[PDB]
Subunit: 134 residues, 3 copies
Amino acid sequence: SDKPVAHVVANPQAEGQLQWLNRRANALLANGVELRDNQLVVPSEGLYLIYSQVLFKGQGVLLCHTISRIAVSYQTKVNLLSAIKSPAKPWYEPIYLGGVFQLEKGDRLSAEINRPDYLDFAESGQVYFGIIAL
Amino acid sequence: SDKPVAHVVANPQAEGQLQWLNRRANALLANGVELRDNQLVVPSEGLYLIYSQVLFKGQGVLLCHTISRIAVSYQTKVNLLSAIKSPAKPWYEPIYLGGVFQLEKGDRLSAEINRPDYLDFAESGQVYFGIIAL
Amino acid sequence: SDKPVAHVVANPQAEGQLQWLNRRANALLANGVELRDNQLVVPSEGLYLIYSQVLFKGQGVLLCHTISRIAVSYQTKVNLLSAIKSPAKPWYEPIYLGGVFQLEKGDRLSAEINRPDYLDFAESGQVYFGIIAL
Ligand SMILES: *SCC1=CC(C)(C)N(O)C1(C)C
Ligand SMILES: *SCC1=CC(C)(C)N(O)C1(C)C
Ligand SMILES: *SCC1=CC(C)(C)N(O)C1(C)C
């Protein structure tokens, strides 16, 4: 298996920040993909499936979630996938994004939310970001 | 790269209609896939990953989103993937659908919502529809 | 086409239970994947894309949805993907999960909700669970 692949997950001990980690069980960062400055770096040109989920939580705002592309050539962030959700017992709100994109070598991808202080990663599998070359 | 692929996005200037476009940056329509009468036409038999997202917006209904298959042989629409969501400051509501399906040559796929007048495509990456042969 | 693949759907006649079926049109269970005791059994090691959607309905709770891995070696359930949603006319709430994972031969996957009595499968395409080897 030599396809570029990543499936990174939120650091559960970061406070007020969405920090992606690969060195967890059931996470991946293989075959050229790099995690640099919290972004995923594409090893080769091609079509990639790109996806991410966040979970928000509260008790008693507009919340969005975006995956953006930084082109190696044009050093400016373009949204590839984006969603917005409007929300004392607790409430939860997931958002999922995923699509296929042609990327070039060295592009960086970030999966970002506007209010990291609303994230819930109390349990595994709740907040994640991945790519696979197809 | 010779895999059939499409990633089409809502026309932001259509009013009250979900019109899919490929001639945008970060959109795709390659290797046999066609966009005909707002539907995606499958070039060859095989397994395809199929997906789509819509974003709804309001201020101050049942809203659904479906991907359907028209078989070349049986000219009738079958839902492959479907979701329903129940919703003066603004509110937003995304819906995501995605799955793998065996399709035959010439099948048409549509990604449809019941109330296009509730869609929000004010910004890129909010409303999209894609397939990839796997 | 020899890739392991499954796309299973909720049994619409089960009452208060999420029972996955493959013997429906537009469903799949091919090339080694097995459905045993309501779980999907992986035929070979490799990277798999794994996904599932549920739809909840009510009229007039915390609702979650998880895909878990049972390792053949370690017979304990780990959540791979999980989401929680907080909700007389009817209301509906979808949840979608999907990610790429390295699995080993004989692993079992389950897609589970905590309140099957809230599920809505009145129509096709609403509740589904699939994998594809990549
Ligand atoms: S999602 C929060 C923020 C406000 C809004 C206009 C809804 N979003 O697009 C951004 C990210 C700018
Ligand atoms: S989603 C809007 C409309 C009504 C309802 C029964 C909820 N949907 O299934 C359709 C598309 C028919
Ligand atoms: S989702 C229902 C149930 C309660 C809660 C803590 C929110 N979930 O994690 C479980 C599955 C335990």
